[PDB]
Point group: D2
Chain length 265, copies 4
């Protein structure tokens, strides 16, 4: 009996289904796939990308940037929700192919630098090309690109480095406070007494509170379904979106159920 | 007028004054200098070093290890209080010259990897040879070496990655809970509204509480004077040592005074 | 049409077929799989591993080390032929699970550090968990472990960092000069006018000459078939092994044929 | 007796004496100090910097870029002769303060990444803030920025990663082939039988031949005096410059004298 072959990280087709750019606000576009968020924020002083999705999405992202008028040199900054393969997958390649630099917190930078390997919960099962961060950010730190101010809100749990990013855009003449909140799920995680993450539960509870309180006229999430976005629904893509409060409440209720199931399991 | 010459990080002579090993408990020795802590914990399955002091201390540390019966191959693990040049200085060289691997939290690992450069408060003024961590630890995680169990207690503030390490040794037949608590000082730091560390004050306040509650029959600190140790006093070196509670209270009182002076300054 | 799913690096079953340790000389054992070399050199001062094979081989390697009397702490050093996924695959995990440190040349270290991503010829198609080198070696540099002297002979081509490692063991009372020579193949490579490797052809020609001249009573290669080893043949596993001269001549003849086919293709 | 204080890397004042930009050809300017080269190549698609000098030169470089019409976002690329502190010193800071990415060969990248520490000859005596390379280049590889084509010519010796960079500019309507050739000195180096660099002599001899044959209407060197440039001499700064052939011959004659002195010493 030979050792097993390596298994690739395969995903639902919709996660890999390209879509054309979908405008969220005056400067903010969804440019990823139907079921993975990748946000382009376009400014008079260059563009910012928040997440890139799966590794094989680099060229599609670049096509959509081009459709928007953003050349590779115009992409200045990549920000991440968290450094798993389905959100940070193409970062290394985008850095090679654009002017983009990565800003991330220390936890995300170290996970990004090992390509998602030695994950606290997934081990080496879900990896991707490693990349280096160019700037380390602290909780509450701001980065400004052509006058869009992005604020980091750490919300550790799904990964130690999970981050919400907030900024204010405009729409129909009025401010829109956009909150790109990270995942609050714990898929197959050992929650209680995890030797690799001993304060996991406390971190999730603090993160629910952080998400609940974000400035949040519009919530977006790395998996759009988690905030009830439907990117394929066109003019009504965001009509059913949750508030940050509702998103945090739903995640906490699910988390509490998982804790009870783990105790019983 | 030429640009200024580079300025070396110079320190009081006592910080660089070698001392012979000073026993703290059955397996735990101070092996650094008179005024910089470097703790050797010797076990039947190899040795652990907590901090190394200044960069030029590597050979002295190695001499004292040898005096204790620890060869380079026997040194298994280096742990750090925080990754400033006067505590992590010789880490890179010790890794080259021993079997030692470094375990640190993500913040300390990223600061260690850039040799203390781009410090949030010191800039590039206090740097040292960079080194890589071999293991990333999470808050409350344990590492066990020949049955001495070391527990990490994050106490962010002096650096984002500041850590207290605790373990239980023996003395005169009874357990001794040793707490190696990191610095709680903020030397020349901008405390309020620091764009590079926006939650600095909240982190220090949480860290005072963490230090106050540590398991702590014996407190040691990276600068021995901060816990009222006198390594040159022989049999009474630790006689005047503070409790963890007293250390935390003194640091908080000093911090509060610094906050008031900063507001007035 | 969705973007394609990620494809895993799959290999012939024999590459993944565990075997028991096979003695090559008094201190040198093959401990990998039937069709991937991983050499254990056991000394009174610890053990050296040369290559590890595929990523999923870590636990098997560790089992065979244990069978040989080598515990994780006894493994001191990992050396590499080249940093592709089927030879360096388990390095990261072995470093986490043993005392082992990696020594490699700069080219191999940088490819190892990006987990084989952005390969000059394979792109991101054949990746693995990234790892850091602990020591950078120069051409002709020696490393000594318990008195086995390992010499590095750079033989760039298959990868920029391809290395032959040589050492002298004993057998039946007499010296045996062992040469672990790297691959000299160029599978699907663009040889002529490659913008990512402009001196590729010159490097291969110099490497054929290097391999031809190695001290070489016994030749071993990362893919055993390349040197006509049959690890499953027991007492006659090495009976048909090529000389280094014959190996270099065969590789050059194949290379010349590939050059002619590329010109015609 | 305390251990000695750290010693800063101090240099002749002229190495730190700022100068205004000095035009070499239509797109190429010296923007460093009187006695350290830092070349700015300005193109319609952004700017390239070759070397930066000492660590404390970052702001001066940025001032001279601004004087030339180059903002921080316009600096696209940093190339290096070699990664010693007096040529790569400010790279880390320039990357933080500009859009610039670093391209270097593997040897230079690994030395840059450890801030010049563990130098083959200098040890930790001459260090600087570490930086990461964004692109690894191979010998003879080209990089093109707004149609200036830069070619790498490895010339190992002074450091393993020493590189000459060549490109074609214009002047008075005609092409000017500029060669920025690295140092060929070996200051205090052990040349013969160096265990850290066993093929040192062979590499220097090959590098003399490489430099002799470069395309070279105008030779520039990291230390201008080595090619008989006088940056403070204005309109005649380059009048006495050596050819590449003369530079290589002089370096080889000096090297041969050093070899003879080492044998006698
Ligand atoms: C079990 C493997 O899990 C994953 O690869 C992800 C990565 S975010 N996490 C899951 C989750 O968060 O429930 C998901 C299905 C949304 S994708
Ligand atoms: C002002 C520079 O500061 C330092 O280099 C250190 C490093 S810990 N911090 C100081 C402090 O903590 O007060 C110190 C004097 C104990 S040394
Ligand atoms: C085409 C992909 O190639 C590979 O993944 C390897 C890695 S060494 N190279 C091949 C070769 O060297 O011919 C091989 C079949 C021996 S495996
Ligand atoms: C002895 C220390 O040396 C150096 O720091 C440099 C760095 S290039 N090398 C010298 C040389 O090349 O002769 C120099 C004086 C030009 S500066
Ligand atoms: Zn995730
Ligand atoms: Zn996901
Ligand atoms: Zn400090
Ligand atoms: Zn200190
Ligand atoms: Zn290969
Ligand atoms: Zn192979
Ligand atoms: Zn130099
Ligand atoms: Zn120099």
């Amino acid at each position: 009996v030979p050792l097993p072959q390596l298994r690739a990280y395969t995903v639902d087709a919709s996660w890999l289904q390209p879509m054309a750019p979908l405008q969220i606000a005056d400067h903010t576009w969804q440019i990823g796939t139907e079921d993975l968020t990748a946000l382009l924020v376009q400014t008079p002083d260059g563009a910012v990308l928040l997440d890139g999705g799966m590794p094989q999405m680099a060229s599609h992202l670049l096509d959509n940037m081009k459709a928007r008028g953003v050349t590779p040199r115009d992409l200045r900054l990549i920000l991440l929700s968290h450094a798993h393969a389905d959100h940070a997958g193409p970062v290394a390649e985008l850095k090679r192919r654009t002017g983009a630099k990565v800003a991330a917190n220390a936890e995300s930078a170290v996970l990004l630098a090992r390509g998602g390997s030695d994950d606290l919960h997934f081990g080496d099962g879900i990896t991707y090309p490693p990349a280096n961060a160019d700037r380390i950010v602290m909780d509450g730190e701001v980065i400004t690109v052509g006058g869009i101010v992005f604020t980091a809100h750490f919300m550790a749990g799904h990964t130690p480095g999970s981050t919400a990013w907030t900024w204010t855009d405009t729409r129909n003449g009025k401010p829109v406070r956009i909150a790109y909140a990270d995942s609050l799920s714990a898929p197959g995680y050992q929650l209680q007494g995890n030797p690799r993450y001993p304060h996991l539960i406390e971190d999730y509870r603090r993160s629910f509170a952080t998400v609940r309180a974000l400035p949040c006229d519009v919530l977006l999430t790395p998996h759009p379904g988690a905030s009830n976005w439907d990117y394929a629904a066109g003019a009504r893509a965001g009509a059913k979106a949750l508030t940050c409060k509702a998103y945090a409440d739903a995640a906490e209720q699910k988390f509490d159920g998982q804790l009870a199931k783990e105790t019983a399991g």
